[PDB]
Amino acid sequence: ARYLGPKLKLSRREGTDLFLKSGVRAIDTKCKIEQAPGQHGARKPRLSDYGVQLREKQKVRRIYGVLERQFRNYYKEAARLKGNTGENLLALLEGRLDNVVYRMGFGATRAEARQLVSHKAIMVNGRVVNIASYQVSPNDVVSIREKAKKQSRVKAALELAEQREKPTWLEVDAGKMEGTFKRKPERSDLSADINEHLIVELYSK
Amino acid sequence: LSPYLQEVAKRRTFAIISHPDAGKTTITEKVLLFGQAISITTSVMQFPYHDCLVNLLDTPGHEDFSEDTYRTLTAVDCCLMVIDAAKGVEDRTRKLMEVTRLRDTPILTFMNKLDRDIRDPMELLDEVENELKIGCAPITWPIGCGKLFKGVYHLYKDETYLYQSGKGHTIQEVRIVKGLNNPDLDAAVGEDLAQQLRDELELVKGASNEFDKELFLAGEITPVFFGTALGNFGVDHMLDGLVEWAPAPMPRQTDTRTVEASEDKFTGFVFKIQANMDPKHRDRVAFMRVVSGKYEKGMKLRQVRTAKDVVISDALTFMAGDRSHVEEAYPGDILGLHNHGTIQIGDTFTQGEMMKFTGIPNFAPELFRRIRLKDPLKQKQLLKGLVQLSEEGAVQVFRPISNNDLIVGAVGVLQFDVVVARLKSEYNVEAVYESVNVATARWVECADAKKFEEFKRKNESQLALDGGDNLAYIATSMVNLRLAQERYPDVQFHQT
Amino acid sequence: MVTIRLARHGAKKRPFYQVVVADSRNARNGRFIERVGFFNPIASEKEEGTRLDLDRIAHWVGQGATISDRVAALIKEVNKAA
Amino acid sequence: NIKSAKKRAIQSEKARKHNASRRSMMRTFIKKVYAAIEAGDKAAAQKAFNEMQPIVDRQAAKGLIHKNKAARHKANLTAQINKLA
RNA sequence: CUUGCUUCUUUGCUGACGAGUGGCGGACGGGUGAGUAAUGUCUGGGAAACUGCCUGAUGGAGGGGGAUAACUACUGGAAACGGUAGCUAAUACCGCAUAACGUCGCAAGACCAAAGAGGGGGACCUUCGGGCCUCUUGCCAUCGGAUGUGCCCAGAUGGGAUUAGCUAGUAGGUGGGGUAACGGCUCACCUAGGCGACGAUCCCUAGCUGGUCUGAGAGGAUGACCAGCCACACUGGAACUGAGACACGGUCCAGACUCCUACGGGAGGCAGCAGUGGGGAAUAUUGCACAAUGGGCGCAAGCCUGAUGCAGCCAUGCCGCGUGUAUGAAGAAGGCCUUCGGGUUGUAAAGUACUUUCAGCGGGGAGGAAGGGAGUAAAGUUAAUACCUUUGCUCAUUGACGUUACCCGCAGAAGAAGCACCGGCUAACUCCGUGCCAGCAGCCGCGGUAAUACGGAGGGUGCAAGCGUUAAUCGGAAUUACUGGG
């Protein structure tokens, strides 16, 4: 299910920083970004329409860590909702529990947040959840149980939370590690760079 | 004085072992008469007998055969020997005594074929006591030589019986004369022949010993018995000796200690997987050692070597050879169960004692010719049904990698058993034989990890799957086995 | 003979009974006249545990429907003064 | 088939004479009245109808006749005997 | 002989209970779609009907008789399985009395039935068999309600015209018989009608439907699992019991196939659950229990249930989780390429610091459990504080799953990642080896000594406990055009 491989090769493959190597350290410049995705990375591709559709889809997926059948299920869930499909798809991607744990700063990277959810530490509404694909309902409160609270791995990785944008749609206590979920995020708030329209183009055919 | 142990004492074991062409089948068919109930099968007769219930267990008697009896003489406490006078003490009997001296079984012998010519009795007893180095104590001796054998004269019973001819079909009784020095017996038999018989009985009293009870258990002085198997006479006196001489069924050795016949945790492990006759099903067999513990109908056995709680409620009893209904019994009997490719030979059973016995005799056979699949449609009956026969002690099927030319394993010579067994409900391929040379002992070996992997790597075209997913190596010559020993396969060795 | 009885719907290790009026010769999950109410035995204390319309049940009592033991226990659960 | 519930077979054998024999004598009485229809004697027809009426009503009572067959017999036979008379 | 300690023959006198008579169920539950093109199914109406078990109302339930099994004595057969001669009971059978809004009839008139059992007891009466009083339950007759079933009509429900005539109980009518009931359903007579180009008769195929898949919709294939109906129970025919069968685990006869025989004759029908042979590419365990539901019987307790509730196997389909995370440049070793400068594999691996989902082990531990049994109290019932119904209340409790879901603790990254593709369609590049050969390929198409196509290596791409191929349906295909072509 999980990739567990070259998480920094994917950032060179898409060119943009996928935040898979976020970590305690800052922007690395230790892998020759944008100029070497692989062995023949010096070639300039033709980069057609289906090409940029597939690159955009795999970019959003390796940001969010969602497999293809699971993302197609998210697209099928977002297609039957109201409004428009592109906002609803990214809202369902943000509604994952491990993404909420990542936005709270409870872990440096996304795989660390998925491991923290999976190892019976993340608890929402007094009920412990192991599945990282937990659809977070609005008006919930997420925290860490007392038997797994602050064994230093949440601690220094919380300092990275002092360097992030700290978005509006969720609030962390940062004294007892008790987060608070709020209303759904607007499209003009989440990372301002990814394109949902190419994903709609790919899953429309 | 509980009746449980009192009928533990009423369960005894005599299988039968003998020479080829000795008369196992005739004497078992005639003991079927005595309770109101060549050679390719095994059969178990429980009995409807009056006094006790003493089981039988047949076996094919040859040198290429009888790998059954190397592991089912371990099952049986006692021993019946059948020796002909024309055959005498031969290499078959020496091999069977090499088997029976290892466990000290009580032995009662039965000289057969009293219709044909038989040598002098003292010469035969000296042949036994010389070529076996084991003494004996005779009780009777019949009349004269040739066809003149018409009587039996007991010593420790003092009973004189006569014989009538042509009684092989019906059960008939001959009248009884009590006295030993009766002149009317001399008139009915013949005076000079009876005087020669009395002189031979005096030579018995002057040149032999008496009977023992504590040394009978070890089997030092093994008693003999006389009579024919066809004349319906000589085996009728065997039953009293079967009642009076044979003890309780002995404890058997485990890895910890001997388990007695008064305990629990049923020790019924499988001895033979028999050459199965197939009406519609296999069931494979389960001949067992349930000497310890009285059965239950809804008992749940425990497979020790796989350590699983297996619910087995169906158990066949061998009443007069026919596989009878679902019946529980008294301990000291041999069952038959319903398995589907799960239980091999020697798989132990307890209710929690996770230990093993000291059995598992019979390893390896010469390599005969092949399977080449005449009428090549529906190969699956030999890809299953002979691999079904591969769990037996006689047949171990070898699968080479090239997916043709599958070797039938035989430890004996006569593979006509499998050829006749290829004409059953789930057996329809012929596979007529020829001459193909594959030499000897595909010596089975499965080494420890990280070291047999390179051994699979270097000569990957020189392996062969076995019955039970084994890979011995491949045996075409002795020089290849010398190269295999030179290759140094350090192994946690199990022979299989 | 008509009767009011449970139907045993739901998933494996997740029972969900259907109290229903049906003929006795029909199957459990078979043909029925009409359904009235339901019962969930694994329903812990929450917003809804058991719905049961007593008007149609009284109508079938007025017609001659034999009430089983579980349906009579549900009638004694839905008590007129409690 | 070997079954403990074979008793309903031979007991139905115990039925298939006796009840049917009653049906037998029933219909012969009916046929007797038809003889009167072939006779033309209205008094004998009335006597035969009065002879057959209580036994056919008893056979309608004992479950053999379903009280509409015997009603049909009484109906059309009464119609014949008062059309003749 | 420890004289009330133990041994022990009779004894239905009790609790109960093989076999037998009888009542009910066996027509439900379960399996398959062989047959069937309308005798079937669906949609919608209708009368000339039935309806045990459920229930409402109104009455009766009186008085007698004869057989029989089981049981005895003899006897036939190997068995299966009886026969002869006696005895006995019933809620089994059969008369007699008696009826009404019931049946027939225009009416007068005629006819039609049963069965009693179990619990408790005051007075009286006991030939001491018990009547008698009360309660519960069962029976008969009628009117009904509901349920299910039977019957009729219209429409709809595949192809073939290289199937154009079909029909003689055929079409209608009268009369008799028959069906719970209309009915050529069946017989006697009379006439020549009846169907049909808006497909009659014949052939092939097919269970039908709600539904499933696909499709924006209209449509197309399918209808396997869930559910309703129909048909079938090795093949065909036939009746009986029973309210309901012209009958899966009922009967007989005729035929095919296995088995026994003492050869006189019998037993059998897995298109039940399991399991086997054969077929085929292809499909499971000869498992646990009535713990819960439902069905059958019984007042009830209790009994059966291969339906069911589960357990085992199969990645067959869907879903989720993990196989680590953070840091870590000498940008190490090895592989590949090279313009031999260097790049790639590659934060990948090694090292360091944490963590352990799921597996292994050791302990707690719900819920699926309602009921039912014993005892007590109160209210009904009745002469009755006795019996019985109902409701609180006290006690002992009822789990195959189950070494349960779930929770806690131990240890160690420790046990857990593969499959296809890389010329275009369509996501991704080189090197080496042959050389229109070996070979690949869904289409266009490559390989003829510089192959981004074959094989191998490196790298990348895509999907993920699944990945490719094959087989089928729909869309794209407005290339069957009614929407929507000439």
Ligand SMILES: Nc1nc2c(ncn2[C@@H]2O[C@H](COP(=O)(O)OP(=O)(O)CP(=O)(O)O)[C@@H](O)[C@H]2O)c(=O)[nH]1
């Ligand atoms: N007349 C006579 N013939 C006998 C007697 N015993 C055996 N036979 C004959 O000897 C032969 C032995 O036959 P069988 O019973 O099959 O021998 P077996 O001992 O079973 C053979 P194996 O040892 O291989 O199991 C037969 O031909 C049989 O008729 C006997 O007492 N009398």
